[PDB]
Amino acid sequence: VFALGNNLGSTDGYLATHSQIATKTSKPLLETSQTVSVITREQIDDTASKTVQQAMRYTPGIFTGQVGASNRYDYVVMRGFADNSVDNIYLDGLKAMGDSGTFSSMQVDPYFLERIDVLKGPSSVLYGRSLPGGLVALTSKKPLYEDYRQITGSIGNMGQKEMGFDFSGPLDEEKRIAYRLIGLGKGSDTQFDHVKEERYAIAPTLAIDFSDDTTLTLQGYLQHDPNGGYHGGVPADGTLSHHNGRHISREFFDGEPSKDDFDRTQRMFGYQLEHRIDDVWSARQNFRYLDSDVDLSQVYAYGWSASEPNKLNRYFSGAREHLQAYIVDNMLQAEFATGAARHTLLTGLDYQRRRTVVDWRSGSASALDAFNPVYGDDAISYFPDDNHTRRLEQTGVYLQDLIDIDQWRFSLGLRQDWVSVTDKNRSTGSKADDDWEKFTGRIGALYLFDNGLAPYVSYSESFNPNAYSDASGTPLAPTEGKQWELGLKFQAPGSNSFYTASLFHITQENVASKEPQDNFYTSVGEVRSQGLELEAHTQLSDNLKLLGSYTYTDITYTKSLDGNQGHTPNQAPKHMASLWADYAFDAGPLSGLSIGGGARYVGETWADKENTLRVPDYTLVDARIGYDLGKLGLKGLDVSLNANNLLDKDYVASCYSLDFCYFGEKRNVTATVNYQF
Numbered sequence: 001v002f003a004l005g006n007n008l009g010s011t012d013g014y015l016a017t018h019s020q021i022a023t024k025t026s027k028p029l030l031e032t033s034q035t036v037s038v039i040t041r042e043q044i045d046d047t048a049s050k051t052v053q054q055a056m057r058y059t060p061g062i063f064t065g066q067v068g069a070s071n072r073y074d075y076v077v078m079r080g081f082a083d084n085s086v087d088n089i090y091l092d093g094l095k096a097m098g099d100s101g102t103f104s105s106m107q108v109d110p111y112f113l114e115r116i117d118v119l120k121g122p123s124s125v126l127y128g129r130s131l132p133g134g135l136v137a138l139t140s141k142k143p144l145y146e147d148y149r150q151i152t153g154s155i156g157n158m159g160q161k162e163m164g165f166d167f168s169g170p171l172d173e174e175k176r177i178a179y180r181l182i183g184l185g186k187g188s189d190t191q192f193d194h195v196k197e198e199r200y201a202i203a204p205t206l207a208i209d210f211s212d213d214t215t216l217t218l219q220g221y222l223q224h225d226p227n228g229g230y231h232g233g234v235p236a237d238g239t240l241s242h243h244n245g246r247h248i249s250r251e252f253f254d255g256e257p258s259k260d261d262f263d264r265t266q267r268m269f270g271y272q273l274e275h276r277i278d279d280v281w282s283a284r285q286n287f288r289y290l291d292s293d294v295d296l297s298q299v300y301a302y303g304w305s306a307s308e309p310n311k312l313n314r315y316f317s318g319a320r321e322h323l324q325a326y327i328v329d330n331m332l333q334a335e336f337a338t339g340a341a342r343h344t345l346l347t348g349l350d351y352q353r354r355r356t357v358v359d360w361r362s363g364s365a366s367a368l369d370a371f372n373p374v375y376g377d378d379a380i381s382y383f384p385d386d387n388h389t390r391r392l393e394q395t396g397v398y399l400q401d402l403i404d405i406d407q408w409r410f411s412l413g414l415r416q417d418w419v420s421v422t423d424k425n426r427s428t429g430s431k432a433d434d435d436w437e438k439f440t441g442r443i444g445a446l447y448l449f450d451n452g453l454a455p456y457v458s459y460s461e462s463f464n465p466n467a468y469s470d471a472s473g474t475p476l477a478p479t480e481g482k483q484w485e486l487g488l489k490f491q492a493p494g495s496n497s498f499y500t501a502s503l504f505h506i507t508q509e510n511v512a513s514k515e516p517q518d519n520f521y522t523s524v525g526e527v528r529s530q531g532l533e534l535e536a537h538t539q540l541s542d543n544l545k546l547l548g549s550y551t552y553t554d555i556t557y558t559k560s561l562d563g564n565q566g567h568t569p570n571q572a573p574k575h576m577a578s579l580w581a582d583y584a585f586d587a588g589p590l591s592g593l594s595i596g597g598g599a600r601y602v603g604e605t606w607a608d609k610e611n612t613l614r615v616p617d618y619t620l621v622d623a624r625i626g627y628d629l630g631k632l633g634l635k636g637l638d639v640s641l642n643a644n645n646l647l648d649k650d651y652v653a654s655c656y657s658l659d660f661c662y663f664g665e666k667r668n669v670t671a672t673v674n675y676q677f
């Protein structure tokens with residue numbers, strides 16, 4: 001049992017029944033007055049999703065192409081909110097604790113995950129600092145109480161290789177103590193020349209039941225990325241149009257080898273303490289400590305040469321970053337009735353503390369020819385170094401009541417945050433400080449008809465520290481999100497099908513804004529995003545599965561001083577849609593055989609804020625083939641073949657600006673062997 005901080009429920013194929021992402025306590029999706037999606041392990045495997053970001057490509061209201069084919073960082077753009085998207089990720093109920101002002105953003109490998117939950121819209125009432133589009137919660141694999149061993153091996157195009165193991169089971173005869181150990185070695189060249197991706201990782205977990213009332217789970221996670229793939233972009237000039245010839249830049253071009261490093265080491269440890277005091281009272285403590293090192297050397301293009309026509313100007317970023325982060329969450333929950341109302345009453349206290357020590361380097365590099373490049377001119381003319389020590393502290397006190405009365409399901413939430421942010425410039429000695437407090441609230445109401453139909457309304461709020469400063473150096477007031485949401489959910493009792501529609505209106509306040517010829521940013525900007533998301537999980541035939549999604553997003557700068565008032569942010573398609581299907585045969589000569597595939601539509605988008613050039617829309621096809629060799633007398637050994645972007649479309653996924661456009665991933669072919677015993 002133990003609802004507190006756990007999803008529970010069941011999962012079948014691609015469909016989960018319950019989640020805790022919106023409640024911090026197990027609640028059926030059908031009875032939750034928020035838009036929640038769950039991506040199961042199976043879905044992650046079936047679509048051959050290599051990253052958390054790619055796992056999200058069949059979920060509505062999420063755009064997955066912020067830096068195109070890059071896999072260095074997880075960019076999950078929700079309801080159109082691309083800024084600070086890298087900070088959307090929670091792991092096991094706790095913020096990842098990276099610093100989106102630095103290069104020190106963490107990445108969790110999907111191999112270690114049981115599920116991915118997605119919460120749309122402002123959600124600070126239970127989490128604190130966060131973005132107005134929503135948040136993502138990763139649930140790691142946990143120790144199983146029966147023996148489970150799996151070895152996995154994979155090989156594909158682009159020099160893709162991966163090997164992993166996954167071992168779990170009990171350690172005593174009474175099954176009160178259990179362990180899990182997951183390992184991973186993997187690598188890939190990219191579609192990009194002179195680029196490499198490489199990762200090694202291990203995660204030990206240990207669960208100990210003390211009594212019927214207490215479980216303690218201890219977790220470690222150690223990950224080393226000696227190479228971080230590609231994190232570059234090139235001008236719209238030679239990608240969305242020709243440049244100086246029919247010359248268009250290849251989907252394979254680079255910056256400078258011999259000065260191309262990205263080394264990221266992540267060391268996490270934590271525990272989850274679950275104690276039931278009563279059938280009424282339960283308590284939980286989630287704790288995670290993170291220590292990471294990032295080392296970066298990157299020469300990159302910035303515009304065309306004014307001198308040499310088919311050459312790009314290049315610049316250099318270098319970084320040595322050490323991040324230390326503590327997060328704890330303390331929860332107390334009472335479940336009780338007051339006459340005809342059932343209350344699930346949660347009070348909590350959470351604490352985040354982060355310290356980032358950064359040494360930044362910058363300079364100018366040699367110009368490079370975009371078509372037919374000559375490498376080896378790696379001399380840099382360095383600019384003044386920039387060294388900082390960044391600190392962030394957040395203390396939150398929150399209270400929630402989930403009230404069930406008759407068919408009504410109500411949600412009431414209140415939270416108070418104290419945030420302290422420091423920036424010491426170690427090059428100049430100057431120190432910026434800022435302390436403030438924010439209240440946030442949420443009210444939700446849902447009606448559960450006994451046919452499985454649930455309409456609902458929700459009001460929700462968020463805040464996030466402002467990335468920009470008055471430029472007098474103090475940070476600006478934190479941004480604020482406010483959402484009204486109307487939704488409809490449907491599950492047919494008994495059916496493994498689930499349908500939802502979500503209508504949303506989000507306002508983001510205090511966004512930084514300035515006149516183009518102004519020095520000082522000011523916090524008077526405003527962004528509004530409204531739209532509709534439709535999502536369907538359909539089961540038929542006992543062996544045909546289906547996923548469908550449609551998204552409409554109207555996001556606008558409703559208030560700006562920069563001359564882009566009324567405009568639509570770049571990287572925000574008005575329309576997206578997807579569909580996936582998987583057919584298995586369980587009887588006949590084709591037994592143990594699986595076939596699946598799907599398609600993904602991303603509407604046209606703006607290349608630039610100033611809305612002067614469009615990035616073409618695109619439709620991509622994914623396919624898979626699998627076979628359980630168990631049917632041939634090889635028990636627990638099965639084989640998969642995957643292909644994403646099957647038609648191998650060469651396209652620009654998105655652009656950060658007219659100077660930085662990103663190529664989508666080329667065809668990815670993958671073949672995997674899994675062995676249980």
Ligand SMILES: CCCCCCCCOCCOCCOCCOCCO
Pocket residue numbers: 455456486487488501502503534
């Ligand atoms: C009933 C009061 C509160 C509940 C509000 C939820 C209503 C959500 O509306 C969904 C209506 O859209 C259904 C679309 O079905 C066909 C697809 O067409 C959509 C293309 O624009």
Ligand SMILES: CCCCCCCCO[C@@H]1O[C@H](CO)[C@@H](O)[C@H](O)[C@H]1O
Pocket residue numbers: 459482484
């Ligand atoms: C679907 C119902 C929409 C109601 C129309 C909005 C009326 C004013 O909206 C108000 O906004 C305030 C701050 O954003 C909140 O504190 C209030 O709860 C809300 O009533």
Ligand SMILES: CCCCCCCCO[C@@H]1O[C@H](CO)[C@@H](O)[C@H](O)[C@H]1O
Pocket residue numbers: 482484485486503504505507530
């Ligand atoms: C998507 C269905 C919900 C209807 C949206 C209600 C209208 C927007 O909501 C209201 O808008 C006002 C002006 O933007 C704000 O001042 C209020 O805080 C906000 O509650």
Ligand SMILES: [N+]
Pocket residue numbers: 101102
């Ligand atoms: N930076």
Ligand SMILES: [N+]
Pocket residue numbers: 315
């Ligand atoms: N620069």
Ligand code: NA
Pocket residue numbers: 568569570571572573604605606607
């Ligand atoms: Na756009």
